Design a protein around this nucleic acid. Sequence first.
DNA 1: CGCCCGCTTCGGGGCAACCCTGCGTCTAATACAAATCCGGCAATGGAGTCAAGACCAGGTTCG
Length: 88
Amino acid sequence: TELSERGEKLPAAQRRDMMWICRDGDRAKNHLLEANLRLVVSLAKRYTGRGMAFLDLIQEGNLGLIRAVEKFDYTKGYKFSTYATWWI
DNA sequence: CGCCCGCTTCGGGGCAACCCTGCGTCTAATACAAATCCGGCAATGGAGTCAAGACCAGGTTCG
């Protein structure tokens, strides 16, 4: 982003492997989301019985999980599920 | 003389359209910012109001 202005000229190998890292991060993000979808279902399974549909509850839990993997930190050394349960 | 192979015929399955043998309570807040109501003076400025007071015009009374 700070390179897209006239910050620096683009070397070929540096450009292509920084593109590889930038594309790899999104695949890792999607991998984490696709991992914890089951936790989302296991949390949403008990808020039924009033008003909304079960798939709607699951989808809003998915959106909360996207927010949780946005604002998740690992240097506190805790498991992901205890942090994401709150946001879901 | 026997034999394949699609054509027709019925069966069974599959599916589309209607009723009741149908018809649960759930963490719990804080922090903050923006929007909005609203309560109360604080400039009015135009619109209504009272009162005087003048304006003659033609009955009405008097000479």
